Amino acid sequence: VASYDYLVIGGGSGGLASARRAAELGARAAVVESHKLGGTCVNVGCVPKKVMWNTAVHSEFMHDHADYGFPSCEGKFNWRVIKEKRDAYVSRLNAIYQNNLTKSHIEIIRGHAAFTSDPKPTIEVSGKKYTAPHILIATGGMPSTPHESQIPGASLGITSDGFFQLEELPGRSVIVGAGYIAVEMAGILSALGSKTSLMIRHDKVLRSFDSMISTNCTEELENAGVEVLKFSQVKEVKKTLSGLEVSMVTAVPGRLPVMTMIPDVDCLLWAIGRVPNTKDLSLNKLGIQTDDKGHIIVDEFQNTNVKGIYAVGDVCGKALLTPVAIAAGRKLAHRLFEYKEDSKLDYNNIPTVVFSHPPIGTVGLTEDEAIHKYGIENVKTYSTSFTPMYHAVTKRKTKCVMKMVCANKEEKVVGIHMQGLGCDEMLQGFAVAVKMGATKADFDNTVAIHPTSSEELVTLR
Amino acid sequence: VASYDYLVIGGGSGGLASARRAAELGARAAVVESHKLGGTCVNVGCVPKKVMWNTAVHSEFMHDHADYGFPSCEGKFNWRVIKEKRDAYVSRLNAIYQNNLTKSHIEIIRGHAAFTSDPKPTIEVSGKKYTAPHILIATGGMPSTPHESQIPGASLGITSDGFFQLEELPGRSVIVGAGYIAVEMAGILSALGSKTSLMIRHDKVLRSFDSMISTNCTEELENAGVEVLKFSQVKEVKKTLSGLEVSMVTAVPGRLPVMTMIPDVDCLLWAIGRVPNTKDLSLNKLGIQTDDKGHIIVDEFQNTNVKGIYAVGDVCGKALLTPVAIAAGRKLAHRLFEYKEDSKLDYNNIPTVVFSHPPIGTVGLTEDEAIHKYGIENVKTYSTSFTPMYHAVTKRKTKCVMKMVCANKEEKVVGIHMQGLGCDEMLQGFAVAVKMGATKADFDNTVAIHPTSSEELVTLR
Numbered sequence: 001v002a003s004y005d006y007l008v009i010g011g012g013s014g015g016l017a018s019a020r021r022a023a024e025l026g027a028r029a030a031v032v033e034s035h036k037l038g039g040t041c042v043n044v045g046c047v048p049k050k051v052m053w054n055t056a057v058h059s060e061f062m063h064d065h066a067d068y069g070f071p072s073c074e075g076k077f078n079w080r081v082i083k084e085k086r087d088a089y090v091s092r093l094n095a096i097y098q099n100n101l102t103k104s105h106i107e108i109i110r111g112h113a114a115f116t117s118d119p120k121p122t123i124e125v126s127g128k129k130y131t132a133p134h135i136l137i138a139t140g141g142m143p144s145t146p147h148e149s150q151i152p153g154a155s156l157g158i159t160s161d162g163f164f165q166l167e168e169l170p171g172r173s174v175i176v177g178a179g180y181i182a183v184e185m186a187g188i189l190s191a192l193g194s195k196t197s198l199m200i201r202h203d204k205v206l207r208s209f210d211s212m213i214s215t216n217c218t219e220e221l222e223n224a225g226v227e228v229l230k231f232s233q234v235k236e237v238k239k240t241l242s243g244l245e246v247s248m249v250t251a252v253p254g255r256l257p258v259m260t261m262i263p264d265v266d267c268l269l270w271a272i273g274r275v276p277n278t279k280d281l282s283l284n285k286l287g288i289q290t291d292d293k294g295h296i297i298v299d300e301f302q303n304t305n306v307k308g309i310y311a312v313g314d315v316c317g318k319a320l321l322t323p324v325a326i327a328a329g330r331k332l333a334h335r336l337f338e339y340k341e342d343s344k345l346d347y348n349n350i351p352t353v354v355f356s357h358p359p360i361g362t363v364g365l366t367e368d369e370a371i372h373k374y375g376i377e378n379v380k381t382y383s384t385s386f387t388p389m390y391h392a393v394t395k396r397k398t399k400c401v402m403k404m405v406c407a408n409k410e411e412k413v414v415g416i417h418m419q420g421l422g423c424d425e426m427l428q429g430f431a432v433a434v435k436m437g438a439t440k441a442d443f444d445n446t447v448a449i450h451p452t453s454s455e456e457l458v459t460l461r
Numbered sequence: 462v463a464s465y466d467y468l469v470i471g472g473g474s475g476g477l478a479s480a481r482r483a484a485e486l487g488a489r490a491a492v493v494e495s496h497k498l499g500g501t502c503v504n505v506g507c508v509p510k511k512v513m514w515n516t517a518v519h520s521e522f523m524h525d526h527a528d529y530g531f532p533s534c535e536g537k538f539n540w541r542v543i544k545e546k547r548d549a550y551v552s553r554l555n556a557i558y559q560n561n562l563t564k565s566h567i568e569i570i571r572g573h574a575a576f577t578s579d580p581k582p583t584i585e586v587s588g589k590k591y592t593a594p595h596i597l598i599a600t601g602g603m604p605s606t607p608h609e610s611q612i613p614g615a616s617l618g619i620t621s622d623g624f625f626q627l628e629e630l631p632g633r634s635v636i637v638g639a640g641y642i643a644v645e646m647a648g649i650l651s652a653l654g655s656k657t658s659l660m661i662r663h664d665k666v667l668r669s670f671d672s673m674i675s676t677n678c679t680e681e682l683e684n685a686g687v688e689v690l691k692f693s694q695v696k697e698v699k700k701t702l703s704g705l706e707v708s709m710v711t712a713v714p715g716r717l718p719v720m721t722m723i724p725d726v727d728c729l730l731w732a733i734g735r736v737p738n739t740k741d742l743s744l745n746k747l748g749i750q751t752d753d754k755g756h757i758i759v760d761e762f763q764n765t766n767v768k769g770i771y772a773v774g775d776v777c778g779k780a781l782l783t784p785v786a787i788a789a790g791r792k793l794a795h796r797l798f799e800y801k802e803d804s805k806l807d808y809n810n811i812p813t814v815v816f817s818h819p820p821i822g823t824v825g826l827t828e829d830e831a832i833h834k835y836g837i838e839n840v841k842t843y844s845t846s847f848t849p850m851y852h853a854v855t856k857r858k859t860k861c862v863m864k865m866v867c868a869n870k871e872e873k874v875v876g877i878h879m880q881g882l883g884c885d886e887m888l889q890g891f892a893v894a895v896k897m898g899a900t901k902a903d904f905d906n907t908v909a910i911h912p913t914s915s916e917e918l919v920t921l922r
């Protein structure tokens with residue numbers, strides 16, 4: 001049994017970040033990874049998605065060339081040109097991450113880890129056993145797919161993983177789901193030319209976001225050509241002579257349900273959820289607590305119910321973002337190896353950007369969450385809706401919506417929600433202000449930068 | 462003599478903002494304007510400039526279409542298509558501003574105001590006299606041009622005002638000056654296809670900005686095809702059979718001066734400075750203090766040396782920006798009509814964006830200003846330089862540079878300077894944080910938004 005100071009299971013966002021910071025502090029660390037370093041984000045997540053979003057953005061702005069005095073570009077987009085440069089970029093990142101571990105003297109153990117029945121927590125990878133007084137589980141998650149028993153033919157559809165393997169742009173695509181991944185995929189496929197439908201169980205997408213955002217985002221999707229199929233779900237899928245045929249039931253409240261067949265579908269993409277990667281760890285051997293979905297239960301310090309075993313990232317099922325796994329991973333390294341016992345991540349005020357068209361930026365409480373926490377009488381919101389100056393001269397239009405949620409007499413800014421051009425790069429700084437406890441007066445006393453869309457947030461009345 | 466509670470001279474950024482806020486507080490106000498409402502910003506400043514910058518941005522990104530899998534767009538940009546839509550937009554804004562004054566019951570007196578010899582401050586506009594216990598001078602400024610005596614033929618060149626009258630893209634252009642207006646004009650003309658030279662007296666542009674920015678900005682200009690002529694100045698200009706011929710002297714320190722003739726110049730644009738609009742006000746009649754350049758001297762509350770007379774905006778010659786004139790104008794209205802005697806603008810930490818390619822964002826102290834204010838031992842800077850993810854797949858590259866200037870033990874963030882894609886919309890929030898007194902730890906404890914360029918500012922080490 002080879003011993004280390006820190007054993008990290010999973011070489012993704014949280015695992016690499018934690019192992020590297022631990023090493024800086026003097027810990028002899030090893031990272032176990034069965035697949036590719038960089039994990040979900042680098043390989044089939046944030047990075048390849050952003051490159052594809054940058055591609056879709058070019059496609060949208062191209063609609064505006066003639067309005068700006070430029071000649072029209074004839075036609076056909078070539079998916080494989082960008083797909084290949086994208087894959088190459090991911091290969092470059094994998095090599096960089098490997099180099100980063102080696103330069104920090106972190107040992108990389110390749111293979112699938114699983115806990116053993118040994119008394120003191122011990123894992124086995126390819127027949128060999130490894131142990132450490134501190135073991136971090138950062139195995140992340142994976143796309144969820146319907147069971148063939150509940151939806152016959154579900155296995156004919158792909159997940160976001162499959163999206164990154166596509167070598168040609170699908171002609172007709174149906175995305176099922178209403179969360180940010182679904183919205184992003186629908187927006188990229190549609191911008192690039194696929195006849196796209198987004199199937200949702202209710203009437204709006206991103207239902208956990210402030211209502212101004214779910215409402216505005218659903219409308220922008222429709223305005224951009226995405227067919228949003230409301231109150232609908234797949235009953236079954238079948239392979240026809242030319243594509244898939246999707247049977248769906250649409251049950252709009254107050255109407256009779258209606259069954260419809262969507263024919264000649266080239267791509268059915270399930271974007272219904274993520275499931276934690278814990279089934280093959282043999283957690284049961286140590287009695288590590290999980291919820292019924294398989295997520296590992298942890299306290300505020302990322303401790304599991306078993307001493308010397310921690311968990312961070314997607315596997316814990318809360319705030320499924322790369323920077324969250326990274327921040328939690330680092331805070332944990334400081335707690336264990338620098339002895340800062342108060343080192344832990346504050347899960348409040350975590351900012352998020354959804355790469356839709358236009359992008360969405362959000363941090364803090366939605367209006368309803370603030371109303372429930374402070375009381376209707378103590379919540380005041382300020383909002384604005386305008387057409388960015390960029391569209392002053394175009395036939396195509398997008399809107400920019402912003403909402404500021406304030407609480408109490410002092411009007412502490414507890415939430416900022418917005419959608420519009422530039423919102424993706426605009427959020428970080430306001431997130432710093434919100435984390436500091438800014439009030440509306442702090443925003444109001446900051447001189448505006450003109451002409452920008454960002455200045456609207458410091459001049460709300 | 463018609464009397465009012467508040468008489469504003471100049472219907473531009475600061476004048477309109479001050480008159481409107483005063484009216485909201487109950488003051489019977491009148492605005493004097495001899496030209497077009499909206500002033501410099503709306504008519505020949507911020508607005509038409511931003512539309513032209515948005516146009517140049519399309520031109521630059523077009524270089525990247527083929528890398529992203531799109532077909533190449535053939536050729537010719539048509540200047541007059543956008544020029545006309547731009548003019549129309551400015552007309553729409555002028556009508557909006559007029560409507561805003563009328564709806565607030567602010568009287569608009571058209572014509573040129575000049576003070577009289579009357580004891581109590583009184584102005585005359587087209588033979589009629591007007592007075593008020595509070596008179597605001599917000600006459601702004603105008604482009605500066607060389608005297609024919611110092612530079613024969615200087616009158617053959619145009620200023621930024623003339624830039625907005627151009628109906629065709631000049632084939633060859635020479636911009637003289639090294640401030641932000643010069644840099645912006647050079648960048649738009651070059652992006653749109655003009656063979657452009659930028660003539661500067663030294664070796665770098667924007668010499669008052671942090672050195673990381675002046676250095677990086679000069680290089681980006683050169684990389685983008687702008688010919689930067691260092692240590693050079695115009696000796697004379699003459700009209701030839703086909704364009705202008707510019708004689709310039711280049712005196713690089715440590716070399717002999719050399720005289721050069723730049724022939725076939727279509728457009729010579731002077732971007733050497735701004736001069737305050739005070740010569741025709743008859744300020745001398747009331748003994749209102751001005752400096753030798755004609756700027757009106759004011760204290761921290763915008764008071765002149767004469768009671769009941771104030772000045773805000775460009776005419777005061779400090780922080781020549783639209784939002785500054787607006788903020789000062791409003792703070793003054795609250796002081797006079799709401800009796801908030803502490804109401805005044807803090808001229809520190811005013812943020813600025815230069816619409817270059819890529820754009821520049823800056824707020825606070827440069828490294829040298831911080832070194833002089835706190836002492837070398839008490840200043841720590843953090844910087845980074847990277848190529849944005851957007852260029853991971855392109856042959857063309859731009860850089861993103863960021864610098865954070867911290868002071869004292871706590872590392873109070875006293876300055877943020879950056880240049881790169883997205884920096885124009887990224888600055889506002891960090892400006893709010895800096896105004897609040899954020900330290901490096903506040904930035905460091907804010908969870909990053911991935912993948913963006915903005916996340917680099919919260920992960921500097």
Ligand SMILES: Cc1cc2nc3c(=O)[nH]c(=O)nc-3n(C[C@H](O)[C@H](O)[C@H](O)COP(=O)(O)OP(=O)(O)OC[C@H]3O[C@@H](n4cnc5c(N)ncnc54)[C@H](O)[C@@H]3O)c2cc1C
Pocket residue numbers: 009010011012013014015032033034035036037038039040041044045046047049111112113114138139140141160181277280281312313314315319320321322323325911912
């Ligand atoms: C389509 C998509 C787009 C996304 N876009 C964004 C975005 O733009 N911004 C953002 O912040 N977040 C985004 N996310 C979320 C982000 O990818 C995750 O939050 C993040 O990857 C979670 O990191 P992690 O360390 O928890 O796990 P992961 O990154 O998934 O890493 C877990 C690693 O552990 C390895 N592993 C698993 N089991 C074992 C085992 N038993 N033995 C050995 N190795 C094992 C896996 O191979 C994997 O490499 C996106 C996700 C998806 C799916």
Ligand SMILES: Cc1cc2nc3c(=O)[nH]c(=O)nc-3n(C[C@H](O)[C@H](O)[C@H](O)COP(=O)(O)OP(=O)(O)OC[C@H]3O[C@@H](n4cnc5c(N)ncnc54)[C@H](O)[C@@H]3O)c2cc1C
Pocket residue numbers: 450451470471472473474475476493494495496497498499500501502505506507508510572573574575599600601602621642738741742773774775776780781782783784786
């Ligand atoms: C090319 C250019 C680009 C710029 N871009 C930006 C930018 O992107 N962002 C930014 O913040 N700033 C920008 N600025 C600066 C900004 O335009 C000024 O800071 C702002 O206009 C100053 O406002 P003001 O109220 O002081 O004066 P002005 O806006 O100039 O208004 C003064 C008004 O008073 C009127 N007037 C003058 N004398 C009299 C008189 N005696 N009687 C009656 N009426 C009179 C004038 O006609 C004018 O309308 C730019 C300026 C220029 C030149």
Ligand SMILES: O=C(O)CCC1c2ccc(O)cc2Oc2cc(O)ccc21
Pocket residue numbers: 054057058059061062390515518519520522523851
């Ligand atoms: O297709 C084009 O010519 C414009 C591309 C483009 C763009 C254009 C104007 C503008 O004001 C902003 C802007 O932002 C982006 C951002 C991207 O990631 C890609 C293209 C752009």
